[PDB]
Design a binder for this molecule. Structure first.
Ligand SMILES: Nc1ncnc2c1ncn2[C@@H]1O[C@H](COP(=O)(O)CP(=O)(O)OP(=O)(O)O)[C@@H](O)[C@H]1O
Ligand SMILES: [Mg+2]
Length: 232
């Protein structure tokens, strides 16, 4: 049956086998849930410090690369630059903080971002109740959750040398999921994707991002780059 030319629908290759992703749901530690609720549902005028916190954690992760190299000099062989990228997406209303730090293994996500008590949580909630600036969150060891000052939902994609890629995700309300992430390989590090609340879209603006990096994150110790989508 001679063919001279095939239509794209005819030549369209079979899909790869359908990937399976294991998803687990966890309760936040009680006080973490209480903090998240508090952060989410209280007005704070100094919300911008959320970025200082997430950049600080990227920073920490990036320092650990340097130190882990002292026991694991193999890491020295990586060609990836140690850096943070800030990626605002006006179309998706997301702000992404990407680092090339050490990343987090599956159990690191579960333990570090929600199941394990932080000892400063109760004091932080009390401080807030007595009218502390939200900025103080940095000194009470719960700074990650500042993400929820600006974000209705947070997704963390992460890849650590010792594990596969995972996605952590929470819209708060007391639980979070962790699933294997068989999607876009991201290489070692972590990507924190903030789905911004409708009225926190100033944090997609390049000038505003620049202002708060300059104000709050001047000692990263690693290049930070802001990716700005050309306006069409
Ligand atoms: N970008 C990132 N890369 C790797 N690990 C990250 C990360 N962001 C968060 N984490 C993990 O999440 C944990 C909790 O972060 P935070 O809530 O900011 C408290 P911390 O930064 O560990 O304490 P500290 O600021 O009192 O030192 C970190 O300890 C780290 O294990
Ligand atoms: Mg921190």
């Amino acid at each position: 049956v001679p063919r001279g030319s095939h239509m794209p629908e005819e030549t369209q290759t079979q899909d790869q086998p359908m990937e399976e992703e294991e998803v687990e749901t966890f309760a936040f530690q009680a006080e973490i849930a209480q903090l998240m609720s508090l952060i989410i549902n209280t007005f704070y005028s100094n919300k911008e410090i959320f970025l200082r916190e997430l950049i600080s954690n990227s920073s920490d992760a990036l320092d650990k690369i340097r130190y882990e190299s002292l026991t694991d000099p193999s890491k020295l062989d990586s060609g990836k630059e140690l850096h943070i990228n800030l990626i605002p997406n006006k179309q998706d209303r997301t702000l992404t903080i990407v680092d090339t730090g050490i990343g987090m293994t599956k159990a690191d996500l579960i333990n570090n971002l929600g199941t394990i008590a932080r000892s400063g949580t109760k004091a932080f909630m009390e401080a807030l109740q007595a009218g502390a600036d939200i900025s103080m969150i940095g000194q009470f060891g719960v700074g990650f959750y500042s993400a929820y000052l600006v974000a209705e939902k947070v997704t963390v994609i992460t890849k650590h040398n010792d594990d596969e890629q995972y996605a952590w995700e929470s819209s708060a309300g007391g639980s979070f999921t962790v699933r294997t992430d068989t999607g876009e390989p991201m290489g070692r590090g972590t990507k924190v994707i903030l789905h911004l609340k409708e009225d926190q879209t100033e944090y997609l603006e390049e000038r505003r991002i620049k202002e708060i990096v300059k104000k709050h994150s001047q000692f990263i110790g690693y290049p930070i780059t802001l990716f700005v989508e050309k306006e069409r």
